[PDB]
Design an enzyme around this catalytic site. Structure first.
Site, mmCIF file in Angstrom:
data_model
loop_
_atom_site.group_PDB
_atom_site.id
_atom_site.type_symbol
_atom_site.label_atom_id
_atom_site.label_comp_id
_atom_site.label_asym_id
_atom_site.label_seq_id
_atom_site.Cartn_x
_atom_site.Cartn_y
_atom_site.Cartn_z
ATOM 1 N N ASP A 36 40.009 48.337 51.266
ATOM 2 C CA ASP A 36 41.197 47.846 51.120
ATOM 3 C C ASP A 36 42.364 48.534 51.476
ATOM 4 O OD1 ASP A 36 42.909 46.028 50.070
ATOM 5 O OD2 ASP A 36 42.694 46.652 48.017
ATOM 6 N N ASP A 232 46.542 44.162 55.318
ATOM 7 C CA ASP A 232 45.811 44.111 54.417
ATOM 8 C C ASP A 232 44.503 43.787 54.203
ATOM 9 O OD1 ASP A 232 44.786 44.209 51.632
ATOM 10 O OD2 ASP A 232 46.201 42.579 50.826
HETATM 11 C C1 LIG Z 1 38.667 40.195 50.918
HETATM 12 O O1 LIG Z 1 39.196 39.058 50.329
HETATM 13 C C2 LIG Z 1 37.951 38.762 49.296
HETATM 14 C C3 LIG Z 1 38.622 37.071 48.733
HETATM 15 C C4 LIG Z 1 37.472 37.165 47.621
HETATM 16 C C5 LIG Z 1 38.262 37.467 46.134
HETATM 17 C C6 LIG Z 1 39.701 38.202 46.530
HETATM 18 N N1 LIG Z 1 39.744 37.626 47.849
HETATM 19 C C7 LIG Z 1 41.159 37.236 48.722
HETATM 20 O O2 LIG Z 1 41.075 36.691 49.584
HETATM 21 C C8 LIG Z 1 42.462 37.481 47.965
HETATM 22 C C9 LIG Z 1 43.361 36.479 47.779
HETATM 23 C C10 LIG Z 1 44.443 36.770 47.086
HETATM 24 C C11 LIG Z 1 45.334 35.843 46.736
HETATM 25 C C12 LIG Z 1 44.787 38.192 46.443
HETATM 26 C C13 LIG Z 1 43.838 39.090 46.741
HETATM 27 C C14 LIG Z 1 44.031 40.430 46.354
HETATM 28 O O3 LIG Z 1 44.689 40.706 45.314
HETATM 29 N N2 LIG Z 1 43.541 41.404 46.903
HETATM 30 C C15 LIG Z 1 43.473 42.948 46.502
HETATM 31 C C16 LIG Z 1 42.430 43.580 46.730
HETATM 32 C C17 LIG Z 1 40.987 42.587 46.150
HETATM 33 C C18 LIG Z 1 41.087 42.499 44.667
HETATM 34 C C19 LIG Z 1 40.214 41.976 43.996
HETATM 35 F F1 LIG Z 1 40.176 41.585 42.631
HETATM 36 C C20 LIG Z 1 39.174 41.457 44.671
HETATM 37 C C21 LIG Z 1 39.165 41.735 46.104
HETATM 38 F F2 LIG Z 1 37.849 41.204 46.638
HETATM 39 C C22 LIG Z 1 39.954 42.290 46.819
HETATM 40 C C23 LIG Z 1 44.859 43.526 47.623
HETATM 41 O O4 LIG Z 1 44.829 44.879 47.221
HETATM 42 C C24 LIG Z 1 46.197 43.108 47.512
HETATM 43 C C25 LIG Z 1 46.652 43.181 46.122
HETATM 44 C C26 LIG Z 1 48.258 43.550 46.625
HETATM 45 O O5 LIG Z 1 48.377 44.740 46.283
HETATM 46 C C27 LIG Z 1 48.406 45.248 45.046
HETATM 47 C C28 LIG Z 1 48.693 44.644 43.868
HETATM 48 C C29 LIG Z 1 48.552 45.147 42.618
HETATM 49 C C30 LIG Z 1 48.149 46.430 42.487
HETATM 50 C C31 LIG Z 1 47.913 47.141 43.494
HETATM 51 C C32 LIG Z 1 48.001 46.608 44.871
HETATM 52 C C33 LIG Z 1 48.238 43.398 48.122
HETATM 53 N N3 LIG Z 1 47.060 43.754 48.561
HETATM 54 C C34 LIG Z 1 42.502 38.894 47.485
#
Ligand SMILES: COC[C@H]1CCCN1C(=O)c1cc(C)cc(C(=O)N[C@@H](Cc2cc(F)cc(F)c2)[C@H](O)[C@H]2C[C@@H](Oc3ccccc3)CN2)c1
Length: 390
Positions: A36, A232
């Site tokens: 990530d 990202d």
């Molecule tokens: C790969 O997609 C996989 C698919 C399956 C489920 C997640 N996903 C997405 O496409 C998705 C969609 C959204 C609208 C947000 C994030 C999101 O928040 N991603 C974060 C990482 C993440 C979190 C999860 F819970 C599950 C994951 F699989 C991946 C990044 O750090 C994002 C978040 C933000 O930065 C932050 C915010 C708060 C604290 C620290 C960093 C910008 N980068 C991920």
């Protein structure tokens, strides 16, 4: 390619994330970790969870050190709580080094782990500024560089297959490469073009112009980076600020008007299907994002195809149809150049020179008529004004 040991070390897909194998503790405990570039905490499941078939067991590691402090990370989507500590970490298919890094042992989580993703943790590769609880918790890559001779740079080649991968296939398929400490020339074609890392927190960049099939979206460039634009790998879709999304969708609909799609499709919620092999790629437009160049008043562009922004999904009836979901969506936190965008390119995160490089990926999906591209230079003025300031 000069880093054969790291080539093809990733697995996964857009929708579930791309992961690399890592080991934590002594003796080493193997875990699959989501790559990530959108966050900065290294965290791993450390307690039983319905979607995990293995997790970090601190009591079995002789090198585990308790930092006696809690940590909480609420991502845009998903969250976890855990306990901080440090332990020895290695990447089997990476540099041949072992480092002591901070590790958040996840004890509770909500919508973080994904059923069937095959990963049990996350590797935040961004900067300390956005690490939780605060910037005093050194990110994994910073530890790696400080403790070894590994150059301060990594590159990512995320490979989308172009079609659905079932559970068995996704486990046996190569999903890409994460080259730690270098650039492998076998992963891309053409030249690498670099855009400045605006500020070191997220990997923030500045978009200076946007085109849909060569047609200028014609918005004040500040809108494209409101309130920021980041690269990202931790997000699947290309996410665009509300007004940009609205303008982009309107233009993409106009370009593909020979076929009408339901609102659910454009909201990225429902899939559209076509008889096997007949997806009308040609009616959908290519999308070009111009990025600030390293030379004054100069920019370059990256162009992606519908093969990148239309994410392959299995049909509900698991038929023989080829189906997809629109992988461009609205954001309220700035532009997010997610996995489906990264899948078209080899991306170089050159931390040492504070720049991000882009080149056409050797594994991007395309057709006989069009290909993704990275081209330049273009004369572009007042690009600094494209950046947003609160
Ligand atoms: C790969 O997609 C996989 C698919 C399956 C489920 C997640 N996903 C997405 O496409 C998705 C969609 C959204 C609208 C947000 C994030 C999101 O928040 N991603 C974060 C990482 C993440 C979190 C999860 F819970 C599950 C994951 F699989 C991946 C990044 O750090 C994002 C978040 C933000 O930065 C932050 C915010 C708060 C604290 C620290 C960093 C910008 N980068 C991920």
């Amino acid at each position: 390619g000069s880093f054969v040991e790291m080539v093809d070390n990733l697995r996964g897909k857009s929708g579930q994330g791309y992961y690399v194998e890592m080991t934590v503790g002594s003796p080493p405990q193997t875990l699959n970790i989501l790559v990530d570039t959108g966050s900065s905490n290294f965290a791993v499941g450390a307690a039983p969870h319905p979607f995990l078939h293995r997790y970090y067991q601190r009591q079995l590691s002789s090198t585990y050190r308790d930092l006696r402090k809690g940590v909480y990370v609420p991502y845009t989507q998903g969250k976890w709580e855990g306990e901080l500590g440090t332990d020895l970490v290695s990447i089997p298919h990476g540099p041949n080094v072992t480092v002591r890094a901070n590790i958040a042992a996840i004890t509770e989580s909500d919508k973080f782990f994904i059923n069937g993703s095959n990963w049990e943790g996350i590797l935040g590769l961004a900067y300390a500024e956005i690490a939780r609880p605060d910037d005093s918790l050194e990110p994994f890559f910073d530890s790696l560089v400080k403790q070894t001779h590994v150059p301060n740079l990594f590159s990512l080649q995320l490979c989308g297959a172009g079609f659905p991968l079932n559970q068995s296939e996704v486990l046996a398929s190569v999903g890409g490469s994460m080259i730690i400490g270098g650039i492998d020339h076998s992963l891309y074609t053409g030249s690498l073009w670099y855009t400045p890392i605006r500020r070191e927190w997220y990997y923030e960049v500045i978009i200076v112009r946007v085109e849909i099939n060569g047609q200028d979206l014609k918005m004040d460039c500040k809108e494209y980076n409101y309130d920021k634009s980041i690269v990202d790998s931790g997000t699947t879709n290309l996410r665009l600020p509300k007004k940009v999304f609205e303008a982009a969708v309107k233009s993409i609909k106009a370009a593909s008007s020979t076929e009408k799609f339901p609102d659910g499709f454009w909201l990225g919620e429902q899939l559209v299907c076509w008889q096997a092999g007949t997806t009308p790629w040609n009616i959908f437009p290519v999308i070009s994002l111009y990025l600030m160049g390293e030379v004054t008043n100069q920019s370059f562009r990256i162009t992606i195809l519908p093969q990148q922004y239309l994410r392959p999904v299995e049909d509900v009836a698991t038929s023989q149809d080829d189906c997809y979901k629109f992988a461009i969506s609205q954001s309220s936190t700035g532009t997010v150049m997610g996995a489906v965008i990264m899948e078209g390119f080899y991306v170089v995160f050159d931390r040492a020179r504070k720049r991000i490089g882009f080149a056409v990926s050797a594994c991007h999906v395309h057709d006989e008529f069009r290909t993704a591209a990275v081209e330049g230079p273009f004369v572009t003025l007042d690009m600094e004004d494209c950046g947003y300031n609160i």
